[PDB]
Every structure is written in structure tokens, then in C-alpha cells.
């Protein structure tokens, strides 16, 4: 009767930046997923491939819990077949995504008077990320003919940009904490059933 540690993910004091999105593995435990949606405390709870209800009657080998913070008008990008700065350069989901995307407003926790600049997103990148790719490189982005030589300047940009969340921002500009559950069914006898 080992219960899956969802409290560590959803109730974490600090969430990671989207460019450095954190990944947690759920294995060898019981996950009663129904308490998650049958709580009505989130603003987005979509499941793809699998169905959110009667979802805890299935067995998987491993469950991945990806967590990060984006603003309100980028939550729609956390979905299969989406485009945008977050989907292209920060966090990409496969077209064949089977799993659940969970988000809720976190203006009370991640916004500060004068701006909370701890949360970052990747603004410049040559090519789109592959699905489930983490790019933490902070190399100066060359957008011109002259070499940057590691110094930001004309046509040489630092790849990461700060959200600067403020409590008086618009809802689309407000911070949202996102948890992505990936259901991976490897060959090993399924270790996360969760009656």
C-alpha cells in the first residue's frame, strides 16, 4: 500500500522555469488519480489518449511528472500539435501524447510586487525542440553575421527572457503552475497501477 508521491509535485514550494522543466518519476506505488480531477481546484485538466475518469483502473510501468511555470496565455501550448515560444523552444509534447496536462493559477505564489524575475523562458533558438527535450544551454544567440564571442550585444541576444510576473497583471499574463503526467508502458510488469 505504497501511495504515489503526488504531493511532492503538485504542492512543491518552488516550481522550475519552463526552459529547465523538472521531471519526476513515479514508480512502484499506488496512484488514485481520481482525487486529482475530482477536486475541481484546477483550471485546466485535459487528458489525451486515456480518459481522465476511470483512469485509475489501468496499469503503467512508469509515470513522468513534468512541472514548470508559464503564463496564462501559454497554457494552451502544452498540448499535442501546438506551436509557440513555449512549445517550440521550451517544452514540446508528442503528437501521439497519451496523458494528462494539469494547470492552475499561481498568481498568489509566483507573483511579487515590483515583478518576480526568477521564472525564465527561452526566447531565441535556431530550431524547434524535439518532444520531451530539455535545453538548458545559456549560450549567446547569434542573430547576425558577426560572431558574438560569448558577449550579448548588437545582434547577439541572451537566449533566456524573464517573465517578470506582477500581481496586477492580466490573467493571460499571470503565472500558472503546470503538471504534465506522461503514462509510459514499458515491457517491465507495470509498477504504477493505482487502484
Amino acid at each position, epitope marked *: 500500500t505504497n501511495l504515489c508521491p503526488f504531493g511532492e509535485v503538485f504542492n512543491a514550494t*518552488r516550481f522550475a522555469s519552463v526552459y529547465a522543466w523538472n521531471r519526476k518519476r513515479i514508480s512502484n506505488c499506488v496512484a488514485d488519480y481520481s482525487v486529482l480531477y475530482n477536486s475541481a481546484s484546477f483550471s485546466t485538466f485535459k487528458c489525451y489518449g486515456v480518459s481522465p475518469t476511470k483512469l485509475n483502473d489501468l496499469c503503467f510501468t512508469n509515470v513522468y511528472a513534468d512541472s514548470f511555470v508559464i503564463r496564462g496565455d501559454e497554457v494552451r501550448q502544452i498540448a499535442p500539435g501546438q506551436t509557440g515560444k513555449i512549445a517550440d523552444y521550451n517544452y514540446k509534447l508528442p503528437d501521439d501524447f497519451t496523458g494528462c496536462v494539469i494547470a492552475w493559477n499561481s498568481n498568489n505564489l509566483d507573483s511579487k510586487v*515590483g*515583478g518576480n*524575475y*526568477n521564472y*525564465l523562458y527561452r526566447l531565441f533558438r535556431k530550431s524547434n525542440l524535439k518532444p520531451f527535450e530539455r535545453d538548458i544551454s*545559456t549560450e*549567446i544567440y547569434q542573430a547576425g553575421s558577426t560572431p558574438c*564571442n*560569448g*558577449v*550579448e*550585444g*548588437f545582434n547577439c541576444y*541572451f537566449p*533566456l527572457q*524573464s517573465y517578470g510576473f506582477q500581481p496586477t497583471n492580466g490573467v493571460g499574463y499571470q503565472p500558472y503552475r503546470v503538471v504534465v503526467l506522461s503514462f509510459e508502458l514499458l515491457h517491465a510488469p507495470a509498477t504504477v497501477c493505482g487502484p
Partner: antibody
Amino acid sequence: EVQLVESGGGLVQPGGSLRLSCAASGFAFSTYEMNWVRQAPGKGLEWVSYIHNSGNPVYYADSVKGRFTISRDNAENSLYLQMNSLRAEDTAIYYCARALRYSTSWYDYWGQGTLVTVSS
Amino acid sequence: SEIVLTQSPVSLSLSPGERATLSCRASQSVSSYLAWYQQKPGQAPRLFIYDASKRATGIPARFSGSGSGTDFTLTISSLEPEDFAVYYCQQRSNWPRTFGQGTKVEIKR
């Protein structure tokens, strides 16, 4: 608005100690290299210490090694400088300097500075 | 070894609209790791040139710099009233980021 507020200066008896603090706001302080630069009254600029954004690459002026130590908090966005065994030679305004990413020494943005005066 | 940066001249008196050139000689080769700062009294310095030819953000075109190795020159093509201040040169080829001892540009009158 990018801000840099130094504080914690003032008078110290020669041979005592201080700790200076820098309050950053308006930018991703965790992605920047940080430095301390002094300027004695009526004199030139002298670089004091350097800190990497990760924090392990640490350098000091040769005249303040073993006495000064630099630290930074990427969560609370604060830079510190602990000063020990202070001399009257250390009397200067200590600026909190903000370096162009990964030049390690081209200081974008400076604080207003705080005046450290060491005298009996 | 402390890389000593010696600036030239000690003082410079020019009228507004005049061309100004400042010198900074290094004891040993710094290659291209040298920048120029400007400081007005009662204020923190201001980055103007870096890597001996690149201008900082918001720096007008009349400021320019060149040089490599052990000799470098900062040029103000036409002096505006707000360009009269003290200028320091700084190297990043060797810890410690030593500075020059300043070239002060006063208004000729």
C-alpha cells in the same frame, strides 16, 4: 525597473569587520555574473571581487585575499561581501556591479554605492 | 603579474564640438580584452566601449575605440557638453580586472 541597492556600510574601527548586501530587482539575477568595485575618495576604480552565476569561480583583488569573501543568493536575489580585518586602506565607496552575460567583467549596471569608512 | 594600464594624457581641455583621443597602454599583451568607462562626479561609472571596439547599449556613434595588444585608443569625434567626464580603461585578460588611473576631460574656456 532594474535596481541595485547596496547597504550595510558605515564606520568600522580599524581591524574590525563588515558585511555588505546588494538587493537586485528587475532582471534575472541568477543568470548574471556579479562583482564588487571600490573607489577611494578622489581616486580611481579598483575591482574587489568576482562571482559566477553558479558561484564556484571566485576571484579577489590580491590585496584583499583571505580577508574578503563574496557570496550570492540566486533565490532571494542578493549579493554579499564579507569584509574582515579591515584597514584604513579599505575606505571607499563599494559599488555592486552587474556584468554583461559571460564577459565576467564588463559591468552593465551599477548600484549607487555605499560608503565604507574604516577609522578609529 | 599585475597588468598595469597607464592612460594618456593625465588631463585634457577641449572646446565642445572638438575631436578627442585618449590613450591606454598595457604592460603586456591583453589582446582585445579592454573596455572604456565614463564617470561623472558623484556617480557610478558607465560602460561605453567593450572589447576595444564594441559600443555598449545606448552609446552614441561619436564614441569609438580601436587597438589591440598593448595600445588602445578611445575617440570622441565631436565633444558634446555631456561627454566631459573622467574615462577609465579596464582589462579582462588577467585577474585582477585592473583599471587605468583615469583621463579627465574638462571644458576649454
